[PDB]
Paper text:
Interestingly, we also determined an apo-form crystal structure of the [name] Claw dimer, in which the highly positively charged LHP region of one Claw monomer is occupied by an aromatic Phe residue together with a preceding negatively charged Glu residue from the remaining sequences of the N-terminal cleaved 3C protease site of a neighboring [name] Claw dimer, likely due to crystal packing. Inspired by these structural observations, we inferred that an aromatic residue (Phe, Tyr, or Trp) corresponding to the I106 residue of CCPG1 FIR2 may also occupy the LHP of [name]. Moreover, the dimerization of the [name] Claw domain in the [name] Claw/p-CCPG1 FIR2 complex is mediated by more additional polar interactions, such as the two Arg–Asp pairs (Arg1491–Asp1500) and two Arg-Glu pairs (Arg1499-Glu1494) of salt bridges, and buries a much larger surface area compared with that of the apo-form [name] Claw (~786 vs ~730 Å2).
Numbering used by the authors:
A (entry chain A): 1493 to 1542, 1549 to 1591
B (entry chain C): 1487 to 1542, 1551 to 1592
């Protein structure tokens, strides 16, 4: 049976996707100090939307992209220089 | 394989001793449960609450399964708020960090 990854996310991992209101974004539930932000493109297929939002959904990792915040005002509400991932995911059930 | 990917995943069904798990508050059953995708309920044993820093409010903790016991409700009024005849598990668990 499949388990949910909570760190070191790989393509094909099952993940718990949760709302992070501080960063105005969905993230992967993790014990890591690194932020894994859900790519905006993946929201529709997970029955998620860009005013109250569902707290969590299960998904499967399809893609991840390494990023560094090079502008202070960014869509992720992270400080300048933050190193993070953007993750595309699809639904699982 | 010469090595395993170690301690990077939590179980969400068919829980086995030693599994890492997400423990969550089940308000409708007035009890902590293992987060699961299966219809079977896995209730946290009352013995396990103090060492997890829970009280008989905190929404969730990561844990490790120390024991599971398959049970059936014999009375309609019971601490788990389940109908008479419900089959469920009681799980002992300790905190897990890393």
């Amino acid at each position: 049976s499949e388990k949910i990854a909570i760190r070191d996310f790989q393509v094909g991992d099952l993940v718990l996707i949760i709302l992070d209101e501080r960063h105005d974004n969905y993230v992967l539930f993790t014990v890591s100090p690194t932020l894994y932000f859900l790519h905006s493109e993946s929201l529709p297929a997970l029955d998620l939307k860009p005013a109250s939002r569902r707290p969590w959904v299960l998904g499967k990792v399809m893609e991840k992209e390494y990023c560094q915040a090079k502008k202070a005002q960014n869509r992720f509400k992270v400080p300048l220089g933050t190193k993070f991932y953007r993750v595309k995911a699809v639904s699982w059930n």
